[PDB]
Write a protein that binds this ligand. Structure first.
Ligand SMILES: [Zn+2]
Ligand SMILES: [Zn+2]
Ligand SMILES: [Zn+2]
Lengths: 48, 64, 48, 115, 339, 257, 79, 48, 48, 44, 184
């Protein structure tokens, strides 16, 4: 069906919807924790 | 089978409370009152005694 | 008879030529691991 | 059948380093600290103590896998400050806080016990 | 009351939190409390009995119980025959592992072949009982019970009483588990995503009623068609014990100690450990024995058989275009032959 | 030099629990403290059982499981005792373990309750906490239990039997001023025992600059250690882990250069 | 010359060329590319494929019975 | 005996499956192409 | 189809055999595609 | 080779040749006695 | 091309399946080369016309210069070429996309590169692919005016049967009968 066969499912899908809401704000410490789990991260913290 | 030594959730000792719990029930205590009398405040520990089945008593009926 | 041996799902052709039991294969229960990559499989040491 | 020994989560097997330091090539003044047989206990306090250092730009830790017993701590400091120096100062600050906490808890016990 | 379920229960009341904690309970998986398991939570015994009979039938052929010496007896295996007692029977209280001989049986050769009983490869237990008697045929008859203790592992099946089965995906210690302000950690964490599609609302009501039962000290009544019991009534009772009326509690992350933003539905639920344990299903094959007729890997886990690479698996590899791997599975790894 | 300056207030101190408040700490330090109460406070527990006779209805390792969970007095002897892995002796010795004996025969018609009071230690400093008594097994007439056990040092990170706590209540921001938890209907939620709010309001006003600074504890003791000893042992043990870590870090820094 | 088949290497040719070359390397065949700290025969074959140094000719059989011989260097690798 | 344990070129060592080993990992019924996919082996300490 | 006031261009039968014997092999090729497409796409599923 | 009778609980020495049967009550179900070898249980 | 499309899609459904996503490729070019939609473009309209003509020759499905090969090549890429022409037209390249010369040259390269990657690979077991592609959906089909559908209908199509379970005949009225219920 010329489309992906696997996607984001269950927790990650339910959480990514909450995560990308307009009113989700992360503190400096919270952000640095998440970037630890980003294998492709360039090591540069973006401007908040 | 036998009263677990510790509460599964928090690790409080409950294996010294089964006989006391039975005695309190013999004294017309309600189950909730008997658990309170024994100091089991967290409902995890109350679960241990309130739901225990003492099958070891049945097993002692069979001759060794 | 000979005819019975060759026909059917469990017959000689379908059961032993089109499909067959193989060496170097393992089977066990599967559990989630969000810390693996999509292209990784966590394997017990006993199977390895 | 495949159950690891319970002690394997806090005991180092022979030839295992408790902590190793690896420079982070992506950005300057960044090092990765791989600590063996440690969990969120030390990872969280070290990370939170580092975030209190104004010269630390990035502080973060992770347990790469719960079945493994490693914590990776990533520290990035300012050019005039070393990640290793930040790490040592963070532990001394934690040790000072814990030692002070021990002394003040002992006094509290004595006051409570006395009356 | 009439099923005698109280007298012979088949489960444990578990503090169950319905939460997405670390992703290890997704897709009908379960997070278990390692500390609770260390305290006997869902610990079980597996008893397996082996029966062996020595029968003499034939002009000079007979079977006896004895320790088969590698020289005297023809048949032999790489197992260990040292555990056997002089009478060919292992003794109670002896630890036995895979490839161990529990019954030493020798059949006189027309010197003598070995028909000794080998303990199941996966099984690793302790000989519990060794019963010897005469069977219905009058021949000497031995039954040996091997006792193995099964501590809940990752991969063991657990179900509530509402069709919500799931294997254990990971076990966290008490400090790693999320806790309430009272220090209560869940024994089991199930994913919230198991509830919506399945619509096992009775699971949520049992958890709410279980919380009231444990706090009140009364066994709750969940008889189906009972107007005297409503969710609102149960919720009102729960409020009287200092809990949120809907069974939610503020939980703290065990790794960081921070309050979780969402309050977690947590309470006692009766779970049951299912017979299906991973250690009874894990099976690995790497050049095992082959069957006589087809000269292909044997069948069955107990026979160290190979997994079937069936037509569907073959059709799949054709679509992949992996001609060589298809040749490995269907020729090289099954029955390579020359004519 | 950015160390915190924590203050301690002990609210309640009994033989079973210690209730205290820590102020001016980070949440990570407060959480690591409770997390050490449970997993890294050493005590002495039975970890080696050798059963000579067991005619009871409970199989051998059923009994051994209970023996391990029986709390033993560990208040001061635990510090003296060495870890059997660290000790240079054979399997066991008095400097790394405590020997226990249990020899009960039932010959009366009345059921015989084998309790922790029937466990006899070779060292008076390490005894079952109950000496009601914890029930190990019930014996029928003609049944006996004869075993010897060795209790060794350990902490909860290995097995829950070395966890000295019976529940560590931990709390902060009882009025939810930081909004670390968002209540869909705050009016529906019971007030915390440490809540300083009036009956009319359910939440403290949001504090944009607030941080978790005050933490409430209720460390209940299984009995192996006094509740105040668990806290002190945790604080020194957590400090030991950090000091041990820094020694390794010093070598690694020196080795690289 | 006079080739009608695609100038690109197919995914099936890449899979077999790499697998076949890896076995040759694993059997002590000379490595056409310069390797630095590479010991896996399959990774070495990948370097040769990228360098277009695999000494293998792919013979593509056409339905009519004829074939076209392509050098691995001639074909366009997907990467 | 180490003499028989001495390796020389052309020998094959049937070594244990290790991290990064490529395996085919299948769930039945095998209905389409994604029912059998290749995975890199990661060794983890349990039986699933 | 031969009936008056009946469109002989769009009037179609869902019976594949009827199409073959009336319209030919190419018509049934198209009709077979449409009928198979109907069952696949009936529930919104898409196949290339 | 001591055998405990399944009914009267009497230890009986039976060789590999003599029939298996209680000396006292003649019961036909025997049980091997617990091995003298002592197994070590971790109390976990 | 517009009239050819009307024949191919009489229903007027413009949704098609084609190799290269031209609209996203243009979007990528705008971001890569920082195209400013407000400013006038430096891309000559003729370069668009000539560039697309050159691109069409590079996208070859049926190679060969003989008339039979040329016609098949024209037919094989007819739909894509129509889509390519109606997207990379000079009017639109200057009116909404506003691509520059550098961006357009990159765009032509991407279409060629992505189109060649879309060509079916010799040795592809497309029959097995089709069987699984039409069989996997069957595992989610239901079983049973009313017309047979789902698995039971799929069987009738592949088990071609003299007597279908629910034979039917869709009749379309030709003259005034179509628009008059009484006459229908
Ligand atoms: Zn409890
Ligand atoms: Zn010692
Ligand atoms: Zn007898």
């Amino acid at each position: 069906s010329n489309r992906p066969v696997m996607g984001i499912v269950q927790d990650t899908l339910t959480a990514v919807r909450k995560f990308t809401k307009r009113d989700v704000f992360l503190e400096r410490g919270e952000v640095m924790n998440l970037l630890m789990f980003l294998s492709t991260w360039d090591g540069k913290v973006p401007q908040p | 089978m036998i009263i677990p030594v510790r509460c599964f959730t928090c690790g409080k000792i409950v294996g010294n409370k089964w006989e006391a719990y039975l005695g309190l029930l013999q004294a017309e205590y309600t189950e909730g009152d008997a658990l309170d009398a024994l100091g089991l405040k967290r409902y995890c520990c109350r679960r241990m005694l309130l739901a225990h089945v003492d099958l070891i008593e049945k097993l002692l009926n069979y001759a060794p | 008879s000979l005819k019975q041996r060759l026909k059917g799902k469990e017959g000689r052709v379908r059961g032993n030529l089109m499909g067959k039991r193989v060496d170097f294969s393992a089977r066990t229960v599967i559990t989630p691991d969000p810390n693996l990559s999509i292209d990784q499989v966590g394997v017990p040491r006993s199977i390895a | 059948m495949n159950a690891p020994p319970a002690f394997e989560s806090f005991l180092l097997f022979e030839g295992e380093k408790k902590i190793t330091i690896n420079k982070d090539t992506k950005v300057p003044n960044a090092c990765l600290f791989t600590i063996n047989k440690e969990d969120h206990t030390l990872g969280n306090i070290i990370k939170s103590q580092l975030l209190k250092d104004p010269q630390v730009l990035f502080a973060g830790y992770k347990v790469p896998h719960p079945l493994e017993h490693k914590i990776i701590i990533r520290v990035q400091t300012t050019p005039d400050y070393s990640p290793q120096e930040a790490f040592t100062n963070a532990i001394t600050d934690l040790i000072s806080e814990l030692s002070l906490l021990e002394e003040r808890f002992r006094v509290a016990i004595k006051d409570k016990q006395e009356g | 009351e009439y099923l005698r379920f109280r007298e012979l229960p088949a489960g444990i009341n578990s503090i169950v939190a319905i939460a997405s904690y670390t992703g290890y309970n997704q897709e009908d998986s379960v997070i278990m409390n390692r500390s609770a398991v260390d305290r006997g939570f869902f610990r079980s015994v597996f008893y397996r009995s082996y029966k062996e009979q020595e029968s003499k039938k034939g002009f000079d052929q007979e079977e006896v119980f004895e320790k088969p010496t590698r020289e005297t007896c023809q048949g032999m295996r790489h197992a260990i025959y040292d555990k056997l007692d002089d009478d060919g029977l292992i003794a109670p209280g002896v630890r036995v592992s895979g490839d161990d001989v529990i019954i030493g049986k020798t059949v006189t050769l027309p010197t003598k072949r070995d028909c000794s009983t080998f303990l199941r490869t996966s099984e690793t237990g302790i000989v519990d009982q060794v019963m010897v008697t005469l069977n219905q045929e009058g021949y000497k008859f031995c039954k040996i019970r091997v006792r193995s203790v099964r501590i809940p592992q990752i991969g063991d099946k657990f179900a509530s009483r509402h069709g919500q089965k799931g294997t254990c995906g990971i076990q966290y210690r008490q400090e790693d588990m999320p806790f309430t302000c009272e220090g209560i950690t869940p024994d089991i964490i199930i994913n919230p995503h198991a509830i919506p599609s399945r619509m096992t609302i009775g699971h949520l009501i049992e958890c709410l009623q279980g919380k009231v039962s444990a706090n009140k000290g009364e066994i709750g009544d969940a008889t189906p068609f009972n107007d005297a019991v409503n969710v609102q009534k149960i919720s009102n009772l729960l409020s009287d014990y200092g809990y949120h009326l809907r069974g939610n509690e503020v939980l703290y992350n065990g790794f960081t100690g921070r309050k979780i933003t969402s309050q977690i539905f947590i309470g006692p639920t009766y779970y049951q450990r299912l017979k299906h344990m991973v250690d009874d299903k894990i099976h690995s094959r790497a050049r095992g024995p082959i069957q006589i007729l087809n000269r292909q890997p044997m069948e069955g886990r107990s026979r160290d058989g190979g997994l079937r690479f069936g037509e569907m698996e073959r059709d799949c590899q054709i679509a992949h275009g992996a001609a060589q791997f298809l040749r490995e599975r269907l020729f090289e790894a099954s029955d390579p032959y020359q004519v | 030099p950015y160390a915190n300056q924590p203050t301690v207030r002990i609210t309640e101190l009994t033989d079973e629990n210690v209730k205290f408040i820590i102020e001016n700490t980070d949440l990570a330090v407060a959480n690591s403290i409770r997390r050490v109460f449970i997993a890294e406070v050493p005590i002495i527990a039975i970890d080696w059982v050798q059963i000579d006779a067991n005619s009871s209805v409970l199989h051998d390792e059923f009994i051994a499981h209970r023996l391990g969970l029986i709390p033993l007095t560990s208040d001061d002897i635990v510090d003296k005792l060495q870890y059997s892995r660290d000790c240079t002796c054979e399997e066991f010795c008095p400097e790394c373990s405590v020997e226990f004996t249990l020899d009960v025969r039932c010959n009366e018609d009345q059921t015989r309750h084998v309790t922790s009071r029937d466990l006899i230690s070779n060292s008076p400093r390490v005894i079952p906490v109950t000496s009601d008594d914890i029930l190990i097994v019930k014996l029928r007439k003609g049944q006996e239990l004869r075993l010897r056990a060795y209790a060794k040092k350990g902490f909860g990170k290995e097995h829950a039997k070395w966890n000295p706590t019976a529940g560590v209540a931990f709390e902060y921001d009882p009025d939810n001023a930081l909004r670390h938890t968002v209540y869909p209907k705050p009016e529906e939620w019971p007030k915390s025992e440490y809540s300083e709010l009036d009956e009319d309001e359910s939440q403290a006003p949001y504090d944009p600059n607030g941080k978790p600074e005050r933490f409430y504890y209720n460390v209940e003791s299984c009995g192996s250690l006094r509740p105040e000893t668990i806290v002190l042992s945790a604080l020194s043990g957590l400090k030991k882990k950090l000091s041990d870590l820094q020694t390794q870090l010093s070598h690694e820094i020196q080795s690289d250069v | 010359q006079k080739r009608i088949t695609t100038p690109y290497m197919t995914k099936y040719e890449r899979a077999r060329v790499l697998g076949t070359r890896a076995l040759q390397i694993a059997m002590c065949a000379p490595v056409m590319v310069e390797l630095e700290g590479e010991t896996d025969p399959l990774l070495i074959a990948m370097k040769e494929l990228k360098a277009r140094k695999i000494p293998i000719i792919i013979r593509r059989y056409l339905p009519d019975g004829s074939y076209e011989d392509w050098g691995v260097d001639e074909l366009i690798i997907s990467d | 005996k180490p003499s028989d344990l001495h390796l020389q070129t052309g020998y094959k060592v049937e070594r244990h499956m290790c991290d990064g080993d490529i395996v085919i990992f299948n769930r039945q019924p095998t209905l389409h192409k994604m029912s059998m996919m290749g995975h890199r082996v990661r060794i983890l300490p349990w039986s699933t | 189809l031969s009936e008056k006031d009946v469109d002989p261009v769009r009037t179609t039968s869902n019976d594949i055999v009827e199409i073959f014997t009336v319209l030919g092999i190419e018509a049934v090729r198209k009709a077979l595609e449409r009928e198979l497409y109907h069952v696949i796409s009936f529930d919104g599923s898409y196949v290339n | 080779m001591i055998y405990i009778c399944g009914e009267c609980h009497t230890e009986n020495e039976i060789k590999s040749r003599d029939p298996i049967r209680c000396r006292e009550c003649g019961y036909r179900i025997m049980y091997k006695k617990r091995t003298k070898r002592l197994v070590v249980f971790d109390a976990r | 091309d517009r009239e050819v499309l009307r024949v191919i899609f009489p229903t007027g459904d413009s949704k098609v399946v084609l190799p290269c996503n031209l609209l996203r490729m243009i979007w990528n070019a705008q971001k890569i080369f920082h195209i400013n939609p407000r400013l006038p473009s430096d891309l000559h309209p003729i370069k668009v016309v000539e560039g697309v003509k050159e691109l069409s020759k590079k996208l070859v499905i049926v190679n060969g210069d003989d008339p039979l090969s040329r016609q098949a090549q024209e037919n094989a890429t007819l739909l894509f070429n129509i889509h390519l022409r109606s997207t990379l037209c000079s009017r639109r390249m200057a009116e909404e996309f506003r691509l520059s010369g550098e961006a357009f040259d990159w765009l032509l390269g991407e279409i060629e590169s992505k189109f060649n990657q879309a060509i079916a690979h010799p040795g592809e077991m497309v029959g097995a692919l089709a069987a699984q592609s039409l069989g996997e959906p069957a595992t989610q089909m239901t079983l049973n005016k009313n017309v047979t559908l789902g698995v039971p209908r799929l069987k009738e199509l592949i088990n071609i049967s003299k007597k279908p379970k629910t034979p039917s005949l869709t009749v379309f009225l030709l003259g005034q009968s179509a628009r008059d219920a009484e006459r229908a």
